[PDB]
Amino acid sequence: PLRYEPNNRDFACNIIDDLPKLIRFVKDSKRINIVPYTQPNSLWRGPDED
Amino acid sequence: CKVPLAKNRSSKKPSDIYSILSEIVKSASGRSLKLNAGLIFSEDKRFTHVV
Amino acid sequence: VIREISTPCLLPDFSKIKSIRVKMHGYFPLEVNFTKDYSASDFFSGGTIIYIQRKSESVFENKASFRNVEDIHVALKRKAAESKNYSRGNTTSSQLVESLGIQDLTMVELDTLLSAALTDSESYNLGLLCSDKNSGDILDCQLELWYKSFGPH
Amino acid sequence: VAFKALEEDDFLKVKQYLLKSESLELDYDQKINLKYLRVKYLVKIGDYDLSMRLINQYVKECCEEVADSNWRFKFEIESINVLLLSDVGIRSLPKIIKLIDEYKEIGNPLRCVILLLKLCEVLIQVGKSMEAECLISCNLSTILEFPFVRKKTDELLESLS
Amino acid sequence: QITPTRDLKVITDELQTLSSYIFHTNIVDDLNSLLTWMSPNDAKSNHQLRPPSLRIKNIIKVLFPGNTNKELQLQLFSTLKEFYIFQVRYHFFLHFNNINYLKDIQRWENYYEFPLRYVPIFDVNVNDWALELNSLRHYLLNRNIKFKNNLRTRLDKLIMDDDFDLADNLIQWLKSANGSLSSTELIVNALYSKINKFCEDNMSRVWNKRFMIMETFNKFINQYWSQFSKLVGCPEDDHELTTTVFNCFESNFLRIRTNEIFDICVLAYPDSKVTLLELRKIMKDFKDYTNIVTTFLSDFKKYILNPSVTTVDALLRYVKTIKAFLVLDPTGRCLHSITT
C-alpha cells in the first residue's frame, strides 16, 4: 500500500483526475450500449467497497 | 458610484463522459429564506410545534 | 442603552438607531455611527445586509515580535478548533516559508544588501532604519550591522 | 511577428510597431496583447520605473473593467520579474505566495511551476541557494514536462552547477 | 535597545591612554593581561573556568577601592563595557553556527559571565547585561531555524516526561528573549499533546462506568493543573481555561468512542450501554452522526459481513447492534441507513 501524504514541497499536481474518465462501447443483442470504462484488470484491483 | 457585487466563488465528483451529456440533454428539455429561518430562530423546537 | 443581540435578529426601526458596531474574535471590528446627515434607513436602502472583511493570520504579520496579546484562552480555543478539522504536519505553505527561513522580510533584504563596500549613502540609510522612531525587529537589525561592520570576514 | 521579434532581439522592429499601436483602432483582445507587448519590451530595455508604474495600472483595470483572471495572472508575473531583476524580489514574496496556495486549489500545473521558478529565483538572489537546490531537486521531475519553461529551467541549472 | 560600538582598536587605545594618565604606572601590561582574561577570543589567556590569581584580584581592588577623576572613571567603565560587549558578540558570532541545544547557550552564558563575579562592571540598578543577553537570544531564535526546531522538540520532550522545573526554566528563557517563537503557542501545543496522551491512556478500553469524563477531568486537574498554572503564570482559579479544557476532554472522548464504536456496540453491549447514554448527550451535529454511521458500517462490513462468519452469530451480533443503536438513537434514522 502506497502512502502519499500531502507535502508542500511536492508541487506535482495531477490533471488526469480533473479530466473526465473514459467510457466503453459494448454492444449487446438488442442494441449498442455505453458503459463506464474499467481496466481489464481493475475488477480485482478496484478500490474495495469493504 | 459602482455597487460592485461580490461573485460567490463556489466550489465534487468528476463522473464520466456519458453522464455529463445525459445530464445536459435532460436539463435541455424560499430555500435560502428557510435556511435563514433555521438560523434566525434556534435553540428550541417552538417553530415546528406552532406550524 | 446598549442592546446585545445575535446576528439573525430584527433590529428596531432605522430612524431610531444612532450607531451600530460589530465585534467578534477574528474579523476586525466595524463600527458606524449615524449622524443627522445620513440615516440608517438610507444606509440600508441598497440592502439590509452589511459585509465584513476577513483579517489575516499571516506569518509576515508576525515578523519578529507579536504585537497581539495572544491570550491563552483564545489560543487553546483556536487549537481545539483546528484539531476538530484535523480530526475530521507540514501541509501548509506558511510552514514551508517558515522552514525556508525567510520569515523576517527586512532582515533577509538587508542581509542581501550588506553582502559584498558599504557606500556612505546606504550606510546612512541603514543607520536611519536602525534609529527609526517606531518599527519591528529594530534590535535584530542593529546586530547585523554590527556583525557586518565588525564581525569575522 | 512582433513577439518573435522580441525573442530574436529585433528591438527596432517592435519599437516602430508600438508607434502604430497608440493611434490604431483595435479589438479588446488585440488591445491587451499590444498592452502586454509594451510591458515586455520595456523590461528588455532596462528602464523599470515607468514600466512598474505602468504594469499595475493595467492589472488594476484588468480586474475592474474586465474580470479577466487569466490576463490578471499573466500581467502579475512580469511585475514579479521586474522586481527580482532589480535585485529586490523580497517585496514580491507576499504576492507570490498568495498565488501559490490559490492556484494549488485550482490545480493548473503550469501556474504552480511558473510560481515555483520565481520562488527559486527569489531564494537564489538572497544568499540561500542551498535550500533552493534542495527544493528544485525534488520537483525537477515535474517541471520538465512544460516546454516553454525549460529554457528558463535549463538556464538555472548551469547557474547552480 | 541601541548599543554603541567604537571598534576594538580605538577602545583599546583609549583604555591604555586613560590608564596611563590616571594611574601614571606601568599597569598597562597588567591591564592587557586582565583584558585577555575577560576576553573569550583567546582561550589560552582567558579564565577557562578557573578563578584568577592574587594579581588580578588586587588590580580589581585597586580599580574598585575629584569630579574630573570621577567622570574619567565613569567613562573608563563605559569603555570597559563597550570592550566586553564587543568581545562577547565576536565570540558568540564565532560559535553561532555551533549552537543546537539549550544547554549550549546556558554553558556559553556561564562562560561569558564567569569573569562577572570577579569584576563588577554592570551597575545593579541598570539591567544592561540582561539586555544584550536577551538581544543575542532574540537573534539566535530569529536566525537559527535548526535551533528553533530543537527548542520545540526539547520542550515537547520535557513536558512529556513531566520535567516541569526545566520546562519552566525554558519558558522563562524564551519569554526573556521575546523571539518569533512565542511561548504561548508552545504551552498550548504542549498542553494539548499532554491532555491527548492522558486521555488516550485513561479513557481507552473502558466503557462500563458512568460520568467518567468528570472523573478523568478531575484526575487530570488534581495531577497537573497546578503545575500548568505555574508554567503559564495565570491564577489557579481561571474558570474559562478550565471550561475550555473540559470541552477538549469531551471532544477527545467523542473521538475515541467514534473510533471504538464497533467494539462498543458489538462486544461490550449491553455492559457499555450506559456510555451510550452519555454519548447521546454529546453528539449534536449531523457530521457526527454521518461519521459514526460510516465508521460503524465500515467495521461491521469489514468483519461481520464476511461469508466465512457463521450466519447465526452474524444475525445475533447484527440484532445486538440494532438494539444498541436504537438505545443510542431513539429516532432510528441511523437504523434505517445501516439497514439500507
Swiss-Prot record, chain A:
Its biological purpose: Component of the anaphase promoting complex/cyclosome (APC/C), a cell cycle-regulated E3 ubiquitin-protein ligase complex that controls progression through mitosis and the G1 phase of the cell cycle. The APC/C is thought to confer substrate specificity and, in the presence of ubiquitin-conjugating E2 enzymes, it catalyzes the formation of protein-ubiquitin conjugates that are subsequently degraded by the 26S proteasome.
Miscellaneous note of the record: Present with 1332 molecules/cell in log phase SD medium.
Protein name as it appears in the record: Anaphase-promoting complex subunit 4
Assembly and interaction partners: The APC/C is composed of at least 13 subunits that stay tightly associated throughout the cell cycle: APC1, APC2, APC4, APC5, APC9, APC11, CDC16, CDC23, CDC26, CDC27, DOC1, MND2 and SWM1.
Localization per record: Cytoplasm; Nucleus
Transmembrane segments: none
Curated annotation (Swiss-Prot), chain B:
Organism: Saccharomyces cerevisiae (strain ATCC 204508 / S288c)
Highest taxon listed in the record's lineage: Eukaryota
Protein's recorded name: Anaphase-promoting complex subunit 1
Protein family membership: Belongs to the APC1 family.
Gene designation: APC1
Miscellaneous comment: Present with 178 molecules/cell in log phase SD medium.
Quaternary structure (record): The APC/C is composed of at least 13 subunits that stay tightly associated throughout the cell cycle: APC1, APC2, APC4, APC5, APC9, APC11, CDC16, CDC23, CDC26, CDC27, DOC1, MND2 and SWM1. APC1 interacts directly with MND2.
Range of the intact protein held here: 842 to 916 of 1748
Paired cysteines (S-S): none
Its biological purpose: Component of the anaphase promoting complex/cyclosome (APC/C), a cell cycle-regulated E3 ubiquitin-protein ligase complex that controls progression through mitosis and the G1 phase of the cell cycle. The APC/C is thought to confer substrate specificity and, in the presence of ubiquitin-conjugating E2 enzymes, it catalyzes the formation of protein-ubiquitin conjugates that are subsequently degraded by the 26S proteasome.
Subcellular locations according to the entry: Nucleus; Cytoplasm; Cytoplasm, Cytoskeleton, Spindle pole
Swiss-Prot record, chain D:
Top-level taxon in the UniProt lineage: Eukaryota
Compartmental location: Nucleus
Signal sequence extent: none
Sequence similarity: Belongs to the APC5 family.
Functional summary from the UniProt entry: Component of the anaphase promoting complex/cyclosome (APC/C), a cell cycle-regulated E3 ubiquitin-protein ligase complex that controls progression through mitosis and the G1 phase of the cell cycle. The APC/C is thought to confer substrate specificity and, in the presence of ubiquitin-conjugating E2 enzymes, it catalyzes the formation of protein-ubiquitin conjugates that are subsequently degraded by the 26S proteasome.
More details: Present with 259 molecules/cell in log phase SD medium.
Self-association state and partner proteins as the record states: The APC/C is composed of at least 13 subunits that stay tightly associated throughout the cell cycle: APC1, APC2, APC4, APC5, APC9, APC11, CDC16, CDC23, CDC26, CDC27, DOC1, MND2 and SWM1. APC5 directly interacts with MND2 and SWM1.
Protein name: Anaphase-promoting complex subunit 5
Species the sequence originates in: Saccharomyces cerevisiae (strain ATCC 204508 / S288c) (Baker's yeast)
Highest classification ranks of the organism: Eukaryota, Fungi, Dikarya, Ascomycota, Saccharomycotina
Gene name for this UniProt entry: APC5
From Swiss-Prot, chain E:
Cellular location(s): Cytoplasm; Nucleus
Transmembrane segments: none
A GO CC annotation given for this chain: cytoplasm
Coiled-coil segments: none
Other facts: Present with 432 molecules/cell in log phase SD medium.
Protein role: Component of the anaphase promoting complex/cyclosome (APC/C), a cell cycle-regulated E3 ubiquitin-protein ligase complex that controls progression through mitosis and the G1 phase of the cell cycle. The APC/C is thought to confer substrate specificity and, in the presence of ubiquitin-conjugating E2 enzymes, it catalyzes the formation of protein-ubiquitin conjugates that are subsequently degraded by the 26S proteasome.
Protein name per UniProt: Anaphase-promoting complex subunit 2
Residues of the full protein shown: 4 to 366 of 853
